[PDB]
A paper describes a structure:
extracellular pH, and works in conjunction with a cognate inner membrane antiporter. excreted by the antiporter in exchange for a new amino acid substrate. that it is a decamer made of two pentameric rings. central pore, with the CTDs at the periphery.
7.5 Å to 6.2 Å resolution. whole upon enzyme activation by pH and the binding of LARA. decameric state upon activation and incorporation into the LdcI-RavA cage.
Author numbering:
A (entry chain A), B (entry chain A): 1 to 366, 368 to 711
C (entry chain A): 1 to 237
The structure:
Amino acid sequence: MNVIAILNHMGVYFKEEPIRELHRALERLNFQIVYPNDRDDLLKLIENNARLCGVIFDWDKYNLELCEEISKMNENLPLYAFANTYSTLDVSLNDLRLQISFFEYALGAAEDIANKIKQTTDEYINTILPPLTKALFKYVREGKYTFCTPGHMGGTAFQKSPVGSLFYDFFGPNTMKSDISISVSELGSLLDHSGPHKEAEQYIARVFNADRSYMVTNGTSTANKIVGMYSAPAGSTILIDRNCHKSLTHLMMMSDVTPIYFRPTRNAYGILGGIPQSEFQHATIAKRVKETPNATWPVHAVITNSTYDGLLYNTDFIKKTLDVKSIHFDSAWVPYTNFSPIYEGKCGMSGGRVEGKVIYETQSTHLLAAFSQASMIHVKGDVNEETFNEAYMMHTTTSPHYGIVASTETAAAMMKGNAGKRLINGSIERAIKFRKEIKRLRTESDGWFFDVWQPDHIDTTECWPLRSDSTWHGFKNIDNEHMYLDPIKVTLLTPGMEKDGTMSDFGIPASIVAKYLDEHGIVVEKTGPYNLLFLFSIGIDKTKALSLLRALTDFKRAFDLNLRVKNMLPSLYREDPEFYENMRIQELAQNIHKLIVHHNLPDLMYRAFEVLPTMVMTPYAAFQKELHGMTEEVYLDEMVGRINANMILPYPPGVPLVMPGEMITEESRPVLEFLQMLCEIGAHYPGFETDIHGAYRQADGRYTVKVLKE
Amino acid sequence: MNVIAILNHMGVYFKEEPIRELHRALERLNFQIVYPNDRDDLLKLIENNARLCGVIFDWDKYNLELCEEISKMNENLPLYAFANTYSTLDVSLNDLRLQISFFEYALGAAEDIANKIKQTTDEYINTILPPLTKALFKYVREGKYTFCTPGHMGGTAFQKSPVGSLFYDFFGPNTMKSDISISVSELGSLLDHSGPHKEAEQYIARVFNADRSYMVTNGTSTANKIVGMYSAPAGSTILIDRNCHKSLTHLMMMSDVTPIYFRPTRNAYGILGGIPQSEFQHATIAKRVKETPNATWPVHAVITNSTYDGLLYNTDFIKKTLDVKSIHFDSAWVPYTNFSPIYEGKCGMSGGRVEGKVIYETQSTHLLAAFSQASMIHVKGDVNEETFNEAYMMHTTTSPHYGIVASTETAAAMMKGNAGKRLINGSIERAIKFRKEIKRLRTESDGWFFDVWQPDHIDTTECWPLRSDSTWHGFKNIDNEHMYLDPIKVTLLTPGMEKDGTMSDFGIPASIVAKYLDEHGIVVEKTGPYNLLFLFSIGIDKTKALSLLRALTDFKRAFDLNLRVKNMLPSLYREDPEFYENMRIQELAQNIHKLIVHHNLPDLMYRAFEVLPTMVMTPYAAFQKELHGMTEEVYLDEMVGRINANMILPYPPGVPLVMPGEMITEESRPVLEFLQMLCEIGAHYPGFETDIHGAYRQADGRYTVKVLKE
Amino acid sequence: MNVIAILNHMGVYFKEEPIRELHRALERLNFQIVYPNDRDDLLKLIENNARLCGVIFDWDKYNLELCEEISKMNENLPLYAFANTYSTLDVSLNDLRLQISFFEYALGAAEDIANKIKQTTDEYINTILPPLTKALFKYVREGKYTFCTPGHMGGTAFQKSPVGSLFYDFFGPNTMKSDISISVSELGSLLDHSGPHKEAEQYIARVFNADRSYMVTNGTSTANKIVGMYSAPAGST
């Protein structure tokens, strides 16, 4: 951070000569000077360049034209204002917060002013950096303790080996030096939540609107189990989103709990809809508690808010309606709700406490910017605060990496204030622009084109409501004033279905677009038969949007030319030269699309997930038997009427189909049929294989699963 | 890695001029040339400098004098040998492995030979680097995928914020770029153990003599729970070292198991002795199984090998004697046993399989060189290999940091081959040298001095046996050919006790030496009333030994001068100026030592840990009640006759005194007396406070604990 | 191939200074920068100069006036377009094939963007070069086999004689090094029509509209006799 901008020729030597003396002194003081073209470029430089860290200007020439403009961009940015005799402060400045150092044009002040600027910059750095990181960096720069562990001592052990020296030199000293232990007593202790760590926790809770915040460095997988084992004793009943993560299966296998499931809805498109109001109401819950053996009133619920496709709950409705004392919003999808006014009344932490209830958000910091495994637990309400820490300490590692912790705290430091508000605004503006660009190209293009699944008007900034009286969303009997489209989650639709949800004569399966994007190194978040998801994060700049936009039009252009698979997908070709030698892209698309139409795939997929297998025993009870070796393998075909030992997780659509302890029957045969069909259809094309976790493909294309013995 | 050494003036222009042409060409090809003083300096340079990566020499001038000497140091080091007409290969070279490129002295080969050397160096780099890291580094250098997550995209998001730019710039690009996900498909997958990860696991298991090896990035805390939940079903009986880590308490609180405890012995010094042979024998185990309600024959044992103070078990004896099918050596202290012949027959993995038993080592890689949280599970024997992975995946994070993983694999790459054998030899040689230096200064010093607790002869390389017929160790009725002193674990003894284990009239409590070392930034591993432990790791070089050695003689010198506390310990002074204003170091020592003698501390400490509180219920049963809020706080004094809710962990001596579910009685009052005494004696001197985890000091010096309600 | 053209003064320091930082970084990265007089000279430079291998320009200043014009000249030529906030893609671009890398004006990207341009240029080279020649050139640059014939080993035998050294030095290393045999197994075999040679034959036949194409290195004199002796038995008319 050493670039100083000068914005001017003033036309008078009496002013210009002292500035020359200062330029020269500053260059000799180890600053890089930069020169914006003009006033308009300066405002863009500041807006676009973080390394520009001060502005020198003539007060009269620029203040009445610049003050408020710069204050909107950065209210601490160093200004070095050169005053005249008649320069004064107009009452209009009263309400602005400005950090200003006033300087005169005079010889002999160079070394002094230079030192002040250098010193003032370090003073500013001290305000913006958070307290623990500040102490850590200062230690790495200045400290010198000997007779210390870790034994490698700032990476010293790595330098004794050529291979170690390569690893050291590749990552660099800072990475190696910032790997410290609690021997640095002045940083307090993460595990005791003491000293600067106390200050860190208060900082986080202050910004994120929590009562209390924990820093977890082993993901929300671990945050769930700390909350679970503290929250859900053996024999208790819990309400749990049937949409559950694997880590909650691992909890269920370890804790003797009885689940009752909230049940999402779905529409013909296959888009998940929210747990309808009926699921929260006393009458519905009582009926399921009535029908579930050993179930008592639920002591703990876990809802996923928002839904994946951006349907946010009226959280005021849920907090009021759901008669449960302990509600855990797994808000992994909406970590940013506190930072836009459009999400008020639509997030877990919104507003104040919930009388008579503890409310949790567990958040996967890593839809923000943070290293993988970073997760937070935000508590709104009262627990046994110290006892909760005993449970935390029993499941926390004793080898915490201080870099991972700093990267999680530094992601917060980034979002701080106004500028972090305007950062996310930028990504919204680009999403809306891109949305309108697709609509335009839809009209202008030759025949078919992509479409965006969205309302007819989107000229407004808001999460657009979805209503039972609207058709665009394609969901059946939707609740009103319930779900809202998040502008930043953009679902693109590939050709292949009609407005009915019935099949078009022309189709392009999305899997082929994925292979194309893979040759071009573009990552696709999630794919379905005719859908692809893109996240317009604060990562995604105009450069990537342009490349994506053009890449998408190129796929279309190239598809419609009917390029050879050999030429358009050489890596696919190498998988089976003979199979692919003369095939053109359209023929690949036609054949796969025809197979889809032939095997009736969409109707079978839809129906597979519209019923539920039968629970025979709990995963826990089944795992106890497994622990004693009471399992055998059988072929997938042989599984109807048997108790499943493993979870079976097929792709697509990427959600559990059978749990340990469940059994497929004739009533629920569509489950097995979908699975068998995926295995059969997937045998035909090299590069287009089946994918089922917990199943074992054999040489003849048959799959084995594990079952409980009798 | 660009420094090339040239070793010579040959006295002939016809040889010297081509070497000049090569020097100049090499400098222009971006190499740094270095020039050892002579042959003897070269051998020391190689031995001391890892960045020296090639040697150029005249073949005849040096081969018959150098070949074997260099081969002993590094059998791949590039040699650039300049041959004469009569140069040939003597049969004596047959058995040496040499990687040699032969070159002639001729003009016109510079660019070609330079490229070969550059190319050959890269070829060598490729041999020594492990395969996954090689692919990762190559990706970071060459790769260019777009439309990718993580959203920060090589740290890009950090650069939008001045504070983020500081964090990015401090740690550096490599740290930020090597933070990748499984989107890098060509590295396979840690969680699937596929592709290069498969190769990595085979590599590790090959070097470490395991059947199978798992890479765990959340410490042996997590490795224990994966092994535990797979290994110890509810209702089972386990044998568990009463010397247990907290993570095993967290397991016990989560699993309904019945423990029977192996019981260590101890001597008057307070040094732990090994579980005596009696504890492993069928008759002893049967008696405890007989006396323990609901206990059946143990299905799983967990022994800590070696002991802390270097008593290694005849592991052949244990594997033969202990009639348990599943034995887990928590070998956190001896990760290096496979690499010295002196440890044969004295480590878990030594030899071959154990017929009829699975044997585990869980190891805390972070007494080697690796980042905190790095842990391995080494399996010797058969489990359900795939099912074990289901249990692994349920407790593994989904946010693995690829740097932590590389640092664990790179610690292995370092230990590879001969040179990693000679690395540890160096630390042994220095330990022995330092040991003899203490003995010398003991004789030569003025009056009292430190002593090393060790046999009378140590001129031999071996782990010295401790025998019942020897007095030096101070343990009572020791088993023979059982315990052995590890040369690298050095216990220093401070004045204060006689050969009897009775108290000297003159004493210097070790706590005062710790404060002195803290002013000098030296870390002490562990301290007791009159003892201090130092680890002579591969970290500890001659520079640190000299500073430590002198620092220790300076403490003595300064103590005997009777310096003011104000001057020798200014930070301590600031804690209570009035208390410390005029006190001299000897007066501080005298008063604290007199307090120790007065309160009879050593006799009370010894007796406190010689009995066991009574188990009323299990920690699990107590925690279930806690989960329902069935706890109250009472003062520490009020705890006899009540069921404890929390673990109480006092310092000293740093091991559990009361478990949840246990109760102090009159029979075991020494437990409570020791605890109360520590609170009382610790009130007198600022900077010398009590330390009990799970106790709450009140303003009047009384402590509160948590108990179960009735 | 290292000359990069820059076409402009934009009148604003906020744009000009990052371009200066890039000019300087590029010159230090071993590129020659060239500066066409103006837009009309640029189109003539491209048309007349094959060593000009990339164009840097402000997107708004030039796209609606240049895109189709450049695409007519060379549809792979690297364009380094510097975007503004309001820059977008008009539907008129739909039918054009463009190979575009989009870059922002920002400090701190020099070494990274420089490496991308260098890397992207090598990536482009890989598209345009035919597969066997690509492998051959790469071998001559990187390969290092010993215990090999030809005995001269990359012209080595020529350097033992002053007269041979003159012939070697006159024709140059590449001529001497590219004189190889089938010992370079990864190029397949002309005589077996295998591997990359198969690909070469399919390439030629594809462009020249043949069913099959043979590569003859002894003129159509020899092609006539191969066709003749196969085609015209004794006693035929």
